[PDB]
Amino acid sequence: SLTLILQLVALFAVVAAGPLVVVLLSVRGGNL
Amino acid sequence: IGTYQEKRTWFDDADDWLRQDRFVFVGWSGLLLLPCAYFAVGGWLTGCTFVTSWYTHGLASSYIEGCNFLTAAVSTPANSLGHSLLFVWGPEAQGDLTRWFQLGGLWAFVALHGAFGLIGFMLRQFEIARSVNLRPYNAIAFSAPIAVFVSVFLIYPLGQSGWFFAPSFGVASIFRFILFFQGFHNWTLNPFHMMGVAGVLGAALLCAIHGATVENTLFEDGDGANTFRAFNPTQAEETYSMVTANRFWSQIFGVAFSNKRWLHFFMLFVPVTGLWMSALGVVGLALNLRAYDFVSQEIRAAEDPEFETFYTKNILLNEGIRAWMAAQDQPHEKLTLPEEVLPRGNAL
Amino acid sequence: IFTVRWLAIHAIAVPTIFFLGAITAMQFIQR
Amino acid sequence: MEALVYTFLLIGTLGIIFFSIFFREPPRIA
Amino acid sequence: ERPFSDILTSIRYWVIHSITVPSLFIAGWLFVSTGLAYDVFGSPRPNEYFTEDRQDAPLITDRFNALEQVKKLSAQ
Amino acid sequence: IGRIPLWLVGTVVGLLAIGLLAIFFYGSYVGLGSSL
Amino acid sequence: QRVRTVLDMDDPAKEETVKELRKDINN
Amino acid sequence: GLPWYRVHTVVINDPGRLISVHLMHTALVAGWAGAMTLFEIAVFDPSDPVLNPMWRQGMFVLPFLTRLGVTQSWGGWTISGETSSNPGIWSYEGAAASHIVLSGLLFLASVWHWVYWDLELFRDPRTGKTALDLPKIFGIHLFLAGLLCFGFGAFHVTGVFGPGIWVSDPYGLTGSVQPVAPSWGAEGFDPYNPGGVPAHHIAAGILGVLAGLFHLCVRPSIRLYFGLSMGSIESVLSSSIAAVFWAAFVVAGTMWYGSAATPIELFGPTRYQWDQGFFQQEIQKRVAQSTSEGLSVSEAWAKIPEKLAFYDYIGNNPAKGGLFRTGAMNSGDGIAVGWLGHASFKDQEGRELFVRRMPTFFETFPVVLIDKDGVVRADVPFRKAESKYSIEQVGVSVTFYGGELNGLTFTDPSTVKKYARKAQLGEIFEFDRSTLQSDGVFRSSPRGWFTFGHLSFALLFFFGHIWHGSRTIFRDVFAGIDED
Amino acid sequence: AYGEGANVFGRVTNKSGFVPYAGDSFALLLPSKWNPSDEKEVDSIVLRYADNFDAVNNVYVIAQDTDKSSIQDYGSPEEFISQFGYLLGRQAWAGQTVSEGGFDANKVSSAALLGVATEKDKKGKTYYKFEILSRTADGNEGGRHQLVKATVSNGKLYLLKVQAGDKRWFKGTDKECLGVLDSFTVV
Amino acid sequence: KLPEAYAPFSPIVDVLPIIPVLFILLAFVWQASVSFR
Amino acid sequence: PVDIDGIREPVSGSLLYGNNIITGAVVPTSNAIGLHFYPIWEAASLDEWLYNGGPYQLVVCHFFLGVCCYMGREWELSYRLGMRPWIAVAYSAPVA
Numbered sequence A: 001s002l003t004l005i006l007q008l009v010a011l012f013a014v015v016a017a018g019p020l021v022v023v024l025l026s027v028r029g030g031n032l
Numbered sequence B: 001i002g003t004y005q006e007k008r009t010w011f012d013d014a015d016d017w018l019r020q021d022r023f024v025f026v027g028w029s030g031l032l033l034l035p036c037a038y039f040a041v042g043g044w045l046t047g048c049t050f051v052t053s054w055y056t057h058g059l060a061s062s063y064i065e066g067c068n069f070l071t072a073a074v075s076t077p078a079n080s081l082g083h084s085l086l087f088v089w090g091p092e093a094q095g096d097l098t099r100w101f102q103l104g105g106l107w108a109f110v111a112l113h114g115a116f117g118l119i120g121f122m123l124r125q126f127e128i129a130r131s132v133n134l135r136p137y138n139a140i141a142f143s144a145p146i147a148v149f150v151s152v153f154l155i156y157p158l159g160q161s162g163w164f165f166a167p168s169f170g171v172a173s174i175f176r177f178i179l180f181f182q183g184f185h186n187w188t189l190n191p192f193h194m195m196g197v198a199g200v201l202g203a204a205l206l207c208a209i210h211g212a213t214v215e216n217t218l219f220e221d222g223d224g225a226n227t228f229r230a231f232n233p234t235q236a237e238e239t240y241s242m243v244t245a246n247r248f249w250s251q252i253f254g255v256a257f258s259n260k261r262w263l264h265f266f267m268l269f270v271p272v273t274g275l276w277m278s279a280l281g282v283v284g285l286a287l288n289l290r291a292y293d294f295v296s297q298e299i300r301a302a303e304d305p306e307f308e309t310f311y312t313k314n315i316l317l318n319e320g321i322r323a324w325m326a327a328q329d330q331p332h333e334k335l336t337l338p339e340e341v342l343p344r345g346n347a348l
Numbered sequence C: 001i002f003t004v005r006w007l008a009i010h011a012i013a014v015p016t017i018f019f020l021g022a023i024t025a026m027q028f029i030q031r
Numbered sequence D: 001m002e003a004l005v006y007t008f009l010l011i012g013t014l015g016i017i018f019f020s021i022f023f024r025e026p027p028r029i030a
Numbered sequence E: 001e002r003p004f005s006d007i008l009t010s011i012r013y014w015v016i017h018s019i020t021v022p023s024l025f026i027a028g029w030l031f032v033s034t035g036l037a038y039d040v041f042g043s044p045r046p047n048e049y050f051t052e053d054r055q056d057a058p059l060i061t062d063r064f065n066a067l068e069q070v071k072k073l074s075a076q
Numbered sequence F: 001i002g003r004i005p006l007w008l009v010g011t012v013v014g015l016l017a018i019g020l021l022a023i024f025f026y027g028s029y030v031g032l033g034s035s036l
Numbered sequence G: 001q002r003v004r005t006v007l008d009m010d011d012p013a014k015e016e017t018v019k020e021l022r023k024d025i026n027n
Numbered sequence H: 001g002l003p004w005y006r007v008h009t010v011v012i013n014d015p016g017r018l019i020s021v022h023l024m025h026t027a028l029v030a031g032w033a034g035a036m037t038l039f040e041i042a043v044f045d046p047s048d049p050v051l052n053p054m055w056r057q058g059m060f061v062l063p064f065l066t067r068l069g070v071t072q073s074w075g076g077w078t079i080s081g082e083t084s085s086n087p088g089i090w091s092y093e094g095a096a097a098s099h100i101v102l103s104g105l106l107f108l109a110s111v112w113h114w115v116y117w118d119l120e121l122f123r124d125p126r127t128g129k130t131a132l133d134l135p136k137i138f139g140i141h142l143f144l145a146g147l148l149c150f151g152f153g154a155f156h157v158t159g160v161f162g163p164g165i166w167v168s169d170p171y172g173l174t175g176s177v178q179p180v181a182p183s184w185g186a187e188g189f190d191p192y193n194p195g196g197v198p199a200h201h202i203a204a205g206i207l208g209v210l211a212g213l214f215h216l217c218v219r220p221s222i223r224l225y226f227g228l229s230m231g232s233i234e235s236v237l238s239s240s241i242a243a244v245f246w247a248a249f250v251v252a253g254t255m256w257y258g259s260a261a262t263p264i265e266l267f268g269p270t271r272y273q274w275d276q277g278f279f280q281q282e283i284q285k286r287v288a289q290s291t292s293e294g295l296s297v298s299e300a301w302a303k304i305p306e307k308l309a310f311y312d313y314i315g316n317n318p319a320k321g322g323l324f325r326t327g328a329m330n331s332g333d334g335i336a337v338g339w340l341g342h343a344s345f346k347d348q349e350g351r352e353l354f355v356r357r358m359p360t361f362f363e364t365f366p367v368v369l370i371d372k373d374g375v376v377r378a379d380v381p382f383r384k385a386e387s388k389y390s391i392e393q394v395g396v397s398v399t400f401y402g403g404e405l406n407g408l409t410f411t412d413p414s415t416v417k418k419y420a421r422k423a424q425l426g427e428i429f430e431f432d433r434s435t436l437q438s439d440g441v442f443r444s445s446p447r448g449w450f451t452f453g454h455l456s457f458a459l460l461f462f463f464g465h466i467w468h469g470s471r472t473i474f475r476d477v478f479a480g481i482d483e484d
Numbered sequence I: 001a002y003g004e005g006a007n008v009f010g011r012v013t014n015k016s017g018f019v020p021y022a023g024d025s026f027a028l029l030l031p032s033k034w035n036p037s038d039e040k041e042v043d044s045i046v047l048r049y050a051d052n053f054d055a056v057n058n059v060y061v062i063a064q065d066t067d068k069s070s071i072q073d074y075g076s077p078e079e080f081i082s083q084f085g086y087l088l089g090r091q092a093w094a095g096q097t098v099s100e101g102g103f104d105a106n107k108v109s110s111a112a113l114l115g116v117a118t119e120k121d122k123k124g125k126t127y128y129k130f131e132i133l134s135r136t137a138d139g140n141e142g143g144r145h146q147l148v149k150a151t152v153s154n155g156k157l158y159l160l161k162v163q164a165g166d167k168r169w170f171k172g173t174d175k176e177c178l179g180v181l182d183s184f185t186v187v
Numbered sequence J: 001k002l003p004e005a006y007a008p009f010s011p012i013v014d015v016l017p018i019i020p021v022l023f024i025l026l027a028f029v030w031q032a033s034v035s036f037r
Numbered sequence K: 001p002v003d004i005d006g007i008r009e010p011v012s013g014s015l016l017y018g019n020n021i022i023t024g025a026v027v028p029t030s031n032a033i034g035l036h037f038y039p040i041w042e043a044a045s046l047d048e049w050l051y052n053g054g055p056y057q058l059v060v061c062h063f064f065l066g067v068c069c070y071m072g073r074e075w076e077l078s079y080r081l082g083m084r085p086w087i088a089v090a091y092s093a094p095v096a
């Protein structure tokens, strides 16, 4: 369903956000 | 083998390979432990995932039937099978693996392989202790869970009418087993069970109190607020003040240990003694030799309607447990008791 | 490979992943 | 009669507790 | 040998296991979804717990003919 | 050899474990054994 | 002599007799 | 010094005082056997072998005397109910006295071996250090055990020279000490076949003699010697403890499940004869026969043996007692006086109803009257406000066949209820309870008490075997590990 | 072991809440979760079911032979009830009690007729429907609701009785009990 | 229900309350990335 | 005996009233009292206080205060001896 698909998209986005920030700070310089 | 030329054999080669220091120690005991323990654990997981209890107990007890982790169980065979070993080649299964699963033979598989896995693990404790030249007090302590397993999963069903009254391997099935003992045996009133409960609770107390005492009587032994880095395993001094611990507990509790060796032997001694006492009590229950009643109190209650104790209340509760549990819990009894004969209270 | 560590790890893990796939499949069973 | 036995056993246990607390072997720093 | 963190951080390990692990997961999924789990382990499907003959739970009452008793009380 | 970070590996593994556990808890309310 | 009626005699008093837990596949 | 739990270690390296403490232990055990026999003779009542047999009176060693052929007493009675005019030396009291005399003689021998511990026999000829040749000692002992086992099986239990053993019918009605022919086929491994005992003892005695000769001849290998520590008596102790708890498990299982060596006339019925309808099926078969032969129901129930009816009572179940319900079953429910007769229940229209018998698990069981087809027709309600199966409304009467109540019909409520509650327990008996002041709760039988004691001893001896095997293997680190 | 796959993404056959059953010339909707019972409290019971949780919540039909032309000639609904009071269960208490409040002389059990209606068949034959609240001195489950639906078809009186607990009745058994009662089709 | 103009954002509304649970796990991720320094 | 359920149906509890060590108990307070804090001076007589379960509330309140102050005393002695203070934290679990 469209509701379940949008919920899954939002869930994947929020779950991947923080790890992406950490990965980007690891590969882009540091200070983490 | 002494100061004598014995010459090497295939036994010596096999011993050299088995006692080799590797990621998992096999040893001679591994040949018994690893397959038996592997098969017991895998059989229990297989039974909880796929194998039903529909033909043995009339129950759903598998994930594939919709049960969760707390509800799925490898259930005991039907009581009409008695104490049959239920080999897959046995007279019941006769080689058919699917019907062997349906008949409850997986319970016997798991129980027997678990018993031999316990034997193999104890032998592994002995073998590793002998290789490292340590005293075998770990195996001596592990004798008590083996005693519990033997008395509960073998001796009790062997004393009853069959494996059906053994515990089924699973969370809610163990809870069934526990409530069954309460209702049918008054197992709380049993002094051997009381000694077992005292041993288990005192051992938990000892573990907590000794860990706290060591962690709070530590020496400084290094700058830094993380004390866990102030210990080096290759050191020849105590890391906590036994004198200070003894002073603290003498002035708090009245008594305190002054002997570290005696303290650690006491930590060994309490749970092992408790589990052995509980095992003896379960052996008593295998023959229905229960501490069910106090006959003087029953006489006093029979000749005096105003005499009530919590013991009499518990007897009433046990009667309720048995009456409301039996029809669904023992299908082989074929008990269809009408509601009017069920013991109940007022408006509940 | 085929050392004792490899054998123990894979005897633990291969049926574990198989059973995990099995249980995940049976989460989506409608009677 | 039985109440006598129960009370005697309880007070004997408490007496053993009292003696084990206040007349224990003192731990020696040596 | 190798200290298992070197194993867990190696592209050779991950290119083997990105094939092996999902294949096993899909194998388990197919095992349940194709009914082979029911066929192998004898667990009844949700529609075949009861037959037209018996509308209650089965009861194995014979021991030395338990094989044919469970064959005739099972889902055919 | 260390080409992939161990923390990244552990984070992905934990994400898959949490997802599988969430699937298991979701399956408690749907399908078989959901009181429905 | 009438084995079925003695089996039915044992049935209600007791539901675990060998007379009824043996050869109960034809029933 | 020694901890209190290590005192007996002082005779580990003293063979003479090990012999002395063994002799003292044997004296104590023989004296217990004699004193227990004397106690059981003093308290035993042989008046009614049918309704007051020994297993109803708490007799524990009296069945073991009766099993091997001692059936008469110096009091003029026989255990089977006849009169003993020539009981001979080997009566119950004779065996008791012989055990007391044996205990005294073993006490004197123990004293002598304690004093004269320092015998040349205990010194080895070469090094002059105290040593026991444990392989050859085991060979001698195994040879003697084989001789004794073969003699017991070939002369005592065959009856060619000894008296035989107790043999009974499957339903424990007649019962007698008889000679037994050995069964050398597969039937010899039938555990309820009495012929298996002589065959086992003959074959195992021959094998024990041959194996003892082997151990007398052939010395152990060095590898097995070091791997089993055959130079240490504690290894022998661990293996012996292993053997004795194996045997304790075997005898406990044999006593609990029943066999040819645990007759019901000596030890009581088993729980499985109640749980499988053994005596109930036999009684119903004996009533069904001679009913097809035209006799009425008042007859063929008066032909039922009262002993057989007593075997069908759950109070004789060994699994209805308690851990602290102590003593004889007579002190529990009374001494049985007579069989009241079979109780047959019928409703107002005419169908026969049967009381659902109490299963072994249930301390209390609801009273239920079920018809021929398995439908519950009557009950004693817990809720008598809107009940619909009460005996009062169903109109249930009870008729008795073959006892002191015979042909007497009761249609009155609460007497139908009392006899239904008594029919819950099996056959109905009257019980004298003022003689021993019976409390009304069921006791266990000697079968159950034996099983309990020996299963508990078996687990404790499993722990002892673990402890001593560990002590033998880990002797060099018993006082601690090296500093290394 | 016939090979058939698991139903994945294939909807549910049930979730209608009821299972039909056609018996000896009658058809009715049983609750989907109820188990058949072999107990025969009346000696003319053709079908009996009971709830898997509570044995108080049961349902049963009786096909009792009748000599009358039809139920409307049997009397009024009150006259129908007065001659069928044995279904309630006889009071097996015979002691004088004035000490049970909400009750009367030497009585521990009472019944109240909550209502009555007359549902007709497709052409002319009515169904005597009933609704009784039975109460006891111990007040088991706050009383029991008995729903009775009866009629005569071909010289046989078919009577359905559904028994439910009152706490069951206000936790939700009322809807399924009324669904059972309003579907007793005997023709 | 949400207001009608905000109704299509109900799927992203239904995910938001778990983000505070995600923050402590993110702290553990960061600590693992600095190798629990 | 104490009317625990508040239904005028007392429960004996004590050795002199026919209990052994296993069955003997200090019976909880009457249900008619509920949570209403029944001390001796709130009773018309000691007999009424005993009938209604007053000893139970007395013992429970004093025991709660005593075990909380036992935990505090454990902290206090650890402080006076120069020890680390978390044995009281460990003892908080049986107190809870």
Ligand code: CLA
Residues within 6 Å of the ligand: B031, B032, B033, B035, B036, B085, B086, B087, B088, B089, B105, B108, B109, B110, B112, B113, B116
């Ligand atoms: C550590 C090894 C080990 C141990 C101790 C056990 C123990 C047991 N398993 Mg087994 N099991 C194992 C590994 C083991 N298993 C393996 C690796 C498999 C997987 C392939 C199985 C699969 C399995 C199944 C499927 C079953 C068992 C069962 C059993 C039980 C009875 C076994 C039996 O009766 O055979 C005893 C056999 C022997 C002692 C072998 C002795 C043979 C001698 C040495 C040679 C004589 C043979 C000779 C050729 C005959 C002709 C003689 C002629 C030449 C003169 C027992 C608890 C059953 C069970 O659990 O019941 C519920 C059961 O159904 N197991």
Ligand code: CLA
Residues within 6 Å of the ligand: B150, B154, B155, H183, H184, H188, H189, H190, H191, H196, H197, H199, H200, H201, H203, H204, H207, H208, H245, H246, H249, H250, H254, H259
């Ligand atoms: C002509 C041949 C002949 C004959 C006819 C017999 C006949 C008999 N033998 Mg045998 N036997 C013979 C020669 C013969 N034997 C020879 C030559 C030997 C070698 C010396 C033996 C050695 C021997 C042994 C060692 C045993 C017998 C037993 C028996 C009986 C078997 C039936 C029975 O009651 O078993 C019932 C007994 C068992 C089934 C025991 C099986 C072993 C179990 C599994 C061990 C249980 C304990 C163990 C620690 C497991 C733990 C359980 C857990 C819950 C803790 C019967 C009297 C048995 C006996 O005396 O039983 C009363 C017995 O144990 N015999």
Ligand code: CLA
Residues within 6 Å of the ligand: H026, H027, H029, H030, H033, H034, H036, H037, H061, H062, H063, H064, H065, H068, H070, H095, H102, H142, H145, H146, H149, H204, H205, H207, H208, H209, H247
């Ligand atoms: C001349 C000596 C002698 C004789 C013939 C008797 C005779 C009797 N004694 Mg015994 N007794 C003796 C000396 C003797 N005793 C001594 C020395 C002691 C002290 C240890 C006792 C202690 C004693 C007790 C405690 C009891 C008796 C009892 C009995 C009676 C029944 C025996 C019975 O059931 O045993 C049955 C014996 C066994 C089943 C043991 C079998 C042997 C096992 C299986 C050996 C296993 C290990 C073996 C080495 C394996 C061999 C391997 C093989 C290949 C060869 C009987 C009147 C009983 C009774 O009722 O009297 C009160 C009883 O309770 N006796």
Ligand code: CLA
Residues within 6 Å of the ligand: H039, H040, H043, H057, H058, H059, H060, H323, H324, H325, H326, H327, H328, H445, H446, H449, H450, H451, H453, H454
């Ligand atoms: C294998 C051992 C054993 C077996 C199975 C039997 C079995 C039998 N004996 Mg016997 N007897 C034995 C050895 C044995 N006895 C010995 C060694 C002696 C000498 C002391 C006696 C002396 C004896 C007498 C004098 C009598 C019996 C009687 C009985 C019967 C009743 C048993 C009973 O009430 O149990 C009671 C069992 C228990 C209460 C369970 C005990 C569990 C533990 C040990 C409790 C203690 C532990 C605890 C920490 C201690 C604190 C207790 C303290 C507060 C008091 C039964 C047939 C009676 C009978 O009917 O004779 C005709 C009887 O009067 N026997």
Ligand code: CLA
Residues within 6 Å of the ligand: H004, H005, H006, H007, H008, H009, H237, H241, H460, H461, H462, H463, H464, H465, H467, H471
């Ligand atoms: C027949 C077998 C047997 C024999 C010959 C031995 C012999 C030995 N044991 Mg023992 N042991 C066995 C069985 C056996 N044990 C069993 C069954 C257990 C488990 C319960 C153990 C567990 C065990 C431990 C844990 C220890 C030994 C140790 C010892 C040594 C000194 C014991 C001592 O001085 O006790 C002195 C005992 C007392 C002063 C009083 C004991 C009183 C008991 C608790 C109750 C009374 C017993 C009763 C009267 C006898 C009737 C019961 C009977 C039927 C068994 C000695 C070599 C010790 C050792 O290795 O020393 C280095 C040691 O620490 N034993």
Ligand code: CLA
Residues within 6 Å of the ligand: B032, B085, B112, B118, B119, B120, B122, B123, B126, B146, H227, H228, H235, H238, H239, H242, H243, H245, H246, H465, H466, H468, H469, H470, H472, H473
């Ligand atoms: C938890 C159980 C266990 C443990 C770990 C110990 C530990 C010990 N035993 Mg052993 N033992 C046990 C139970 C146990 N035993 C039992 C039940 C028996 C039978 C009475 C014995 C008999 C025995 C003797 C006679 C001796 C010891 C000795 C020893 C020591 C050396 C190790 C050894 O030989 O292992 C023993 C090996 C095993 C326990 C492994 C058994 C594995 C079997 C063969 C698998 C068979 C499976 C097969 C399919 C049957 C299943 C059929 C099914 C239907 C039931 C050590 C302290 C020896 C020693 O050196 O003492 C100083 C010694 O002489 N043991």
Ligand SMILES: C=Cc1c(C)c2cc3nc(c4c5[nH]c(cc6nc(cc1[nH]2)C(C)=C6CC)c(C)c5C(=O)[C@@H]4C(=O)OC)[C@@H](CCC(=O)OC/C=C(\C)CCC[C@H](C)CCC[C@H](C)CCCC(C)C)[C@@H]3C
Residues within 6 Å of the ligand: B036, B037, B038, B040, B041, B044, B110, B111, B113, B114, B115, B117, B118, B121, B138, B141, B142, B144, B145, B149, B168, B169, B170, B171, B174, B271, B272, B275
């Ligand atoms: C429920 C309680 C309980 C569990 C689960 C448990 C578990 C364990 N204890 C061990 C050890 C010990 N336990 C000890 C004392 C105690 N253990 C106790 C209570 C427990 N101990 C108690 C109370 C004591 C005090 C006396 C000691 C002294 C040791 C050890 O030395 C040892 C260790 O190293 O621990 C760190 C471990 C090694 C066992 C092994 O590999 O066997 C090998 C055999 C196997 C795996 C096969 C057994 C299969 C079983 C018997 C039957 C099948 C059961 C299913 C697989 C699961 C069913 C689950 C449902 C019932 C819910 C294992 C994790």
Ligand SMILES: CC1=C(/C=C/C(C)=C/C=C/C(C)=C/C=C/C=C(C)/C=C/C=C(C)/C=C/C2=C(C)CCCC2(C)C)C(C)(C)CCC1
Residues within 6 Å of the ligand: H028, H029, H030, H031, H032, H035, H100, H101, H102, H103, H104, H105, H107, H108
């Ligand atoms: C000198 C002499 C003589 C005399 C002798 C005699 C007289 C002997 C005896 C003896 C005896 C008379 C003995 C007896 C004994 C006993 C015993 C030895 C016992 C016991 C006990 C026990 C061990 C127990 C325990 C227990 C209890 C307590 C309870 C329960 C539990 C139990 C079981 C644990 C003569 C002249 C002949 C000769 C010369 C010399």
Ligand SMILES: CC1=C(/C=C/C(C)=C/C=CC(/C)=C/C=C/C=C(C)/C=C/C=C(C)/C=C/C2=C(C)CCCC2(C)C)C(C)(C)CCC1
Residues within 6 Å of the ligand: B038, B039, B040, B041, B042, B043, B045, B046, B109, C012, C015, C016, C019, C020, F017, F018, F020, F021
């Ligand atoms: C039966 C049998 C057998 C055996 C088998 C085996 C031995 C195998 C296996 C197997 C196995 C071995 C399986 C498995 C499974 C597993 C599983 C199923 C798992 C799990 C887990 C989970 C599901 C969870 C996780 C988690 C998460 C998610 C996160 C948090 C934490 C936790 C942990 C909770 C044979 C064939 C021989 C034959 C006979 C019988």
Ligand SMILES: [Fe+2]
Residues within 6 Å of the ligand: B214
């Ligand atoms: Fe420590």
